[PDB]
Design a binder for this molecule. Structure first.
Ligand SMILES: Nc1ncnc2c1ncn2[C@@H]1O[C@H](COP(=O)(O)OP(=O)(O)O)[C@@H](O)[C@H]1O
Lengths: 62, 62
């Protein structure tokens, strides 16, 4: 609670590149970063692809 | 075509979606479990109805 998220947001704003946070602690499913081959029904890509799509920029502050 | 055009489309996965929503309806759902249930329902919908991960999601939802 030292404002790590807030300070990261502030540096993202100051540097002018789009901001985005990512929580990895406690995760076990590596597929969340890799998605699935798309052969599976309803398969979705890795969360980083979603981050890039939402941010709309190729140089966000992950 | 009779089944789909009549207006019953999107009724799929209702046994695992609508029935549980009704089951929760009578219950005064706290916000925490409400959002957890929404996330689990979304994961169930994304996953294919015939996979082990879908079965685990259904079991946790039940
Ligand atoms: N100097 C500050 N200015 C603004 N917000 C702060 C400051 N210090 C702490 N905070 C707040 O503390 C919260 C903490 O998040 P963070 O420290 O990243 O991890 P944690 O989840 O452990 O709190 C933020 O929401 C932030 O708004």
């Amino acid at each position: 609670g030292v404002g790590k998220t807030s300070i990261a947001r502030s540096i993202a704003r100051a540097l002018n590149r789009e901001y985005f946070r990512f929580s990895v602690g406690g995760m076990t499913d590596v597929a969340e970063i890799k998605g699935h081959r798309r052969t599976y029904v309803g398969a979705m890509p890795g969360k980083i692809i979603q981050c890039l799509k939402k941010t709309k920029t190729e140089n966000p502050l992950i | 075509i009779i089944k789909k055009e009549l207006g019953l489309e999107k009724d799929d996965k209702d046994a695992i979606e609508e029935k549980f929503r009704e089951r929760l309806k009578e219950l005064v759902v706290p916000k925490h479990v409400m959002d957890v249930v929404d996330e689990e329902l979304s994961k169930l919908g994304l996953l294919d109805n015939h996979s082990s991960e879908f079965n685990v999601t259904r079991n946790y939802l039940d």
